[PDB]
Design a protein around this ligand. Sequence first.
Ligand SMILES: COC(=O)[C@@H](NC(=O)[C@@H](NC(=O)CC[C@H](O)[C@H](Cc1ccccc1)NC(=O)[C@H](C)NC(=O)[C@H](C)N)C(C)C)C(C)C
Lengths: 99, 99
Amino acid sequence: PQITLWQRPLVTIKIGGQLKEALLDTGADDTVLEENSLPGRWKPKMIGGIGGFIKVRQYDQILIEICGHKAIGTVLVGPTPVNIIGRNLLTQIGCTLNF
Amino acid sequence: PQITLWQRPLVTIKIGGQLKEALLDTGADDTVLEENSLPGRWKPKMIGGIGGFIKVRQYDQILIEICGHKAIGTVLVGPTPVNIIGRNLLTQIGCTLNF
Ligand SMILES: COC(=O)[C@@H](NC(=O)[C@@H](NC(=O)CC[C@H](O)[C@H](Cc1ccccc1)NC(=O)[C@H](C)NC(=O)[C@H](C)N)C(C)C)C(C)C
């Protein structure tokens, strides 16, 4: 599909059985989603945003269906305002920027 | 042009006589650039990112050339890690997301 930026780019995702909406973010090197009930072993890690650094929990090799497109990656869960689809995933569903 | 997300999406901009590189960010409602020597009257304002809120200085009706494309908008200057091209500008050079 084709997406114009008049409105924030939101999408429907399916992660470990729960249906959420995420934001397609080209300025995000990483995939970071809110606190969700995720099972597996994780690791402490830090990431930065305009306002600073939140400690996240780093889960790898998670299955996520983006706009009905299946991908597999590292996802980090933390105290984020909005869920974000970063470049580590957008490359996978082969997302391009155009102008 | 066509842009794949293997590498952060960077671009060359020209703002009030100085040549900088900015990041094309679809998850950014707003254009926020580092401290630059900008002239005109401004206003205090707050914005939020994953890590919080920085007070910015809000300048409106600024001329900015994006990848050799001229646009006019509100730009906010602040203590940001990287310059960002938000949606208020990407709509103007008619940028779309594609998948
Ligand atoms: C209003 O609600 C909001 O969400 C407010 N905030 C926003 O819209 C903000 N957007 C946002 O907060 C959306 C996320 C931005 O794209 C940042 C940009 C960034 C890239 C590289 C280094 C540092 C920062 N990405 C990130 O923070 C991503 C997750 N991670 C990184 O950049 C890491 C450190 N590599 C802007 C301040 C950029 C506001 C504009 C309304």
